[PDB]
Write a protein that binds this ligand. Structure first.
Ligand SMILES: Nc1ncnc2c1ncn2[C@@H]1O[C@H](CSCC[C@H](N)C(=O)O)[C@@H](O)[C@H]1O
Ligand SMILES: Nc1ncnc2c1ncn2[C@@H]1O[C@H](CSCC[C@H](N)C(=O)O)[C@@H](O)[C@H]1O
Ligand SMILES: Nc1ncnc2c1ncn2[C@@H]1O[C@H](CSCC[C@H](N)C(=O)O)[C@@H](O)[C@H]1O
Ligand SMILES: [Mg+2]
Ligand SMILES: [Mg+2]
Ligand SMILES: [Mg+2]
Ligand SMILES: [Zn+2]
Ligand SMILES: [Zn+2]
Ligand SMILES: [Zn+2]
Lengths: 437, 437, 437
């Protein structure tokens, strides 16, 4: 009945987890000093919930999978496992090792069948087995009804979903980080509850952001495609286009040789991690608007800041998340004009609910926001009238602040109409064959 | 005997629910983290009360229905289900799935008959069955005596009611959001107890309203038909004309080939959600005035505010709801002239009874209202006399404030005299047929 | 023995009810969220008391009745039910439905006879039965000895009473709102204990009265016949002439072909609701004066106020009721001159005994009254002398204040000498016939 997570029994994250999964009983049982524990716990609980949702005797496609995670499960999984990243051979070797280790002690699972399928794929690499294949998402021939994406950021979402749908899949899930900070086009940012920082490749030599490094000395800039992610002490390169492609609107159409109508919604949300549910049906129905909405339970901040990159002083924008209680407790102070130092002292007085290294920039954002409010109250126009004497002036905005219980809305695309080699090596196949034997 | 609702046991909304349904026993039993829970609970209790009102052995038309909600009920429902929105195929598939799942475990309900009717409609799409059809409201041929509208905002009320009445219906119900803010012709607004914000399509790029999104930068306007609604994180487009059409007067006439006299009244009201009861009788009787009345148990505010839309500074009107206790506790302060900052500090001191993101604009409205009162006391006219020396000046009004235990009144129309394709697809029909089997 | 009322067990109104009916035991038993509960409770208790007064085996005429209210009573009622308003067909249908529902379960009442009379009237509409007819008050042929008017404001009182008296009626009762504010000729007013506001048709676009509605903008008047009443959220149009006609003097004469001497007195009075008892006797006796008296247990206020109607600033008079304890506690302050703001703060300090939305205007009235007193003390005349040098000046009066334990007196008329179609439809008759069967 209860679910066990590998975090310390005194952490404050546990509270939040119990709020996000009220249908479970969460128990802390710590065994490793892992520095990316919270993300692992969230993914574990998400998979538990998804399994509890769908009915048995349904085959499930696992896109970009690590097979060792699905061994002790009683459901039917077909793992789609190409070898495109540098961490895949180790995952395959670990899977083979774990399969060999427990060969007669566990009998309620299809262990012998799994070994047979692995050996068959090793012998001939272009064959589909009930539990394994070596193709990509757009070339696997297996037919199923459910698909799952877990921490997959390297595919174009509409094309992948269309190729999943033309094979009879009616339900899909997606687990990963929230894509909202990338629709605002920021330079760098943090997910502080998960110990995650990310930065654009051009500001890696800054001084006072989460992920940077610089030296000692005596004495156009716009976002690009390539981004670096750091979860704990693990590094991942990412692309802005593919991250943006997963920010889907509420309803959309897929129009090719066959046609489908699909809808997407968010079912779990905890401080930056989300779970998305997508349903697809045959035929065209209704009409689309092209808007995507995000609900904010915490505060979301984006602001402009000044730093030195490689010794040269520049300015760019950063984003972060703020707990709701602090935002509620700062309501009265922001009615006047306040300097950044006083705001910093007040925030330190209220605070650990939030990480300290993020405080100095937050205090700089609030101070600006309040000021921009006062000016609005002092230059009051007339109702239903615009002045455009033919040019009109644009005011300056240095801060965007989405308070708890508000919503963001953005215009995206909603109509889509436009949409092999083994890669393995002889020594790796021989090693796997010997490991199984 | 008791009724269970899917909200947390510590929420303050529960209190209000117990005040709106004093004939029930409300128990919290939370199973999902749904962010639109309060609206669902209100709708659930409303349906329970309506069922407890009318007598059994009466057939009930369900206009624009989701059939899966009526499966486990012992009453007789005829669901009118066209496919005009993009969320309908999924609802139909869910209905078929739920019907198939419980086929022999539940025997007190007409499960087998429901399956037979669904299969018959799938085989031929232009046939009426006792529990299902695929026509619209003005083309269904079934005869009944009660009709129900649940969260239906996309029909013209007099025409629909006339077509319901010429078929022998004598009673109707309507559940939805209050239409008063749209008779005042506001730009944007909030229902804060239900986590709902709405805005006109022209101000979606503002900065400091509930539903908007903007960017960072260095540097005639009147309401239109199209409106956007956001309930939790679900988005709905709406039209002002159809929303306004449901704000009916106390008595009205329907004059066509046959004639009817009808009357409408509000029976449940909780912070923005209402239940309306309409009765229709044959023949013409009495005479009409054309007025509609709203009773305010909380405070209702409408005020003018200044913002920047896409960088350009403009002014427009917003509306909101205020709890009665705060309004009662602000009576003494508003006897003098008060600045917005002092009002903001006082409101924060009194406050969480109300959401904080709504406070800064409320504090701006009160401050103006009080000032407009003082001027009235300082320019006193004579009894029963008007000055029109031929033009007379009009004063300026920046705030409308309806205090608890007051009433709004508005002039509307009260005399009405002026009032098909399957749309389904072969793959969807085949999928439903296979799902049932 | 005890009487049950549909109000909440914590309301302060209950106290007052127990003071008005000391011969009963009042118990709260709340079942509906009705917003006009207090008026319903008062009417219920009034009917109980009237029934307890008169002796049995007397037939009672019920003028302008709703028959469903008299079904479960053991007395003999003859209901006079024309169809002149738009709410009558629904009342008739409800009566028929309730009659059909309990046809064999209740046997101590003349249920079968009631059904027979209803069917007979349906068959032929111009016949009198022991319990039903379709005529007006001046055309019913039934003979009785008691008549009852319950919330009837649409008849001319002397003519109706004469036509009741020429048929052998010797006693009559009247239940309704107090008519005193209409003999003072006010523009608008409130009954705050019953959640009732009323206004003249010409000031429906004001801003700061109980019943009004206005908009946002940048920039002879005398009372007329038509008035609007709002009880909770129910709207009723009324005429000033017919309301005034029910303010009868202590003794009066009816002189026609036959002659009668009648007298009227008030027997129950609670914060605006009254019960009146009228007795009529054959022949002419005594002589009349033509005065009507009202006793005040609470404070009654009438004052001049300034507002904006449709944007134009005007002045008119409003009236209200004030609890006796507040009036007693303001005696010492009103010995000097006091500003409206100080009076508002003092009233808020004393106050919830009274509704807050009525406070700002009350504070404005008191402040004026006190001032008008000081001037009187500073311009002192001689005993038994008038100055009329031939014109005399008239002073200005802006407030009328009737304190508790005082009496109003007014001159009215006391000598009176000057005093049909079915209207039903075939479909309604058929519907009633089918409902009974
Ligand atoms: N086009 C494609 N189709 C299917 N899988 C792909 C793919 N491109 C990359 N991948 C795989 O996606 C994986 C992302 S790493 C994610 C691994 C796994 N989901 C986990 O939870 O750890 C990589 O191993 C890569 O091999
Ligand atoms: N003219 C019409 N007649 C009948 N139904 C209509 C209609 N126009 C739209 N509808 C239906 O009304 C529905 C509104 S969505 C409401 C669904 C349901 N009442 C619920 O509680 O969830 C849509 O599914 C749409 O199919
Ligand atoms: N001239 C007349 N003679 C008798 N009844 C009349 C009348 N004019 C109007 N009425 C009736 O008086 C009623 C007033 S509404 C009052 C209904 C009832 N007394 C109650 O307590 O609810 C209307 O239904 C109308 O039909
Ligand atoms: Mg690791
Ligand atoms: Mg939902
Ligand atoms: Mg009513
Ligand atoms: Zn495969
Ligand atoms: Zn039908
Ligand atoms: Zn009669």
């Amino acid at each position: 009945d209860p679910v066990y997570v590998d975090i310390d029994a005194d952490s404050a994250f546990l509270k939040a987890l119990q709020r996000a999964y009220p249908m479970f009983e969460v128990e802390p049982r710590q065994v490793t000093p892992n520095d990316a524990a919270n993300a692992r716990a969230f993914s574990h609980l998400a998979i538990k919930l998804i399994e509890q949702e769908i009915d048995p005797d349904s085959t499930i496609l696992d896109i970009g999978s690590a097979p060792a995670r699905r061994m002790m499960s009683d459901r039917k999984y077909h793992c789609v496992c190409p070898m495109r990243s540098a961490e895949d051979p180790e995952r395959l070797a670990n899977y083979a090792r774990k399969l060999a280790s427990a060969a007669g002690k566990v009998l309620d699972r299809n262990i012998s069948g799994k070994i047979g399928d692995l050996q068959a794929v090793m012998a001939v690499p272009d064959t589909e087995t009930p539990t394994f294949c070596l193709h990509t998402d757009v070339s696997c021939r297996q037919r199923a009804d459910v698909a799952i994406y877990q921490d997959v950021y390297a595919v174009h979402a509409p094309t992948s979903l269309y190729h999943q749908a033309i094979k009879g899949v009616r339900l899909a899930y997606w687990v990963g980080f929230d894509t909202t900070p990338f629709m605002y086009n920021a330079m760098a940012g943090a997910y502080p509850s998960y110990s995650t920082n990310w930065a654009d490749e051009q500001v890696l030599k800054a001084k006072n952001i989460g992920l940077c490094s610089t030296d000692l000395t005596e004495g156009k800039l716009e976002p690009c495609d390539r981004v670096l992610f750091s979860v704990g002490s693990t590094l991942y390169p990412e692309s802005r286009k593919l991250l943006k492609s997963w920010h889907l609107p509420s309803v959309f159409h897929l129009k090719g040789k066959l046609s489908f109508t699909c809808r997407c919604d968010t079912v779990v949300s905890c401080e930056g991690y989300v779970v998305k549910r997508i349903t697809m049906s045959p035929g065209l129905y209704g009409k689309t608007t092209g808007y995507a909405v995000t609900h904010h339970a915490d505060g979301f901040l984006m602001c402009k800041t000044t730093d030195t990159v490689d010794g040269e002083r520049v300015s760019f924008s950063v984003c972060t998340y703020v707990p709701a209680t602090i935002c509620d407790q700062m309501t009265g102070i922001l009615a006047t004009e306040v300097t950044p130092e006083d705001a910093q002292k007040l925030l330190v007085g209220l605070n650990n609910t939030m990480k300290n290294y993020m405080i100095p920039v937050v205090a700089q954002a609030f101070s600006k926001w309040a000021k921009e409010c006062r000016k609005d109250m002092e230059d009051e126009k007339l109702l239903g009238v615009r002045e455009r004497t033919w040019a009109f002036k644009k005011q300056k905005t240095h801060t965007v602040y989405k308070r708890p219980d508000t919503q963001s809305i953005q215009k995206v695309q909603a109509e889509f109409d436009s949409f092999w080699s083994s890669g393995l090596s002889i020594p790796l196949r021989t090693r796997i064959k010997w490991l199984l034997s």
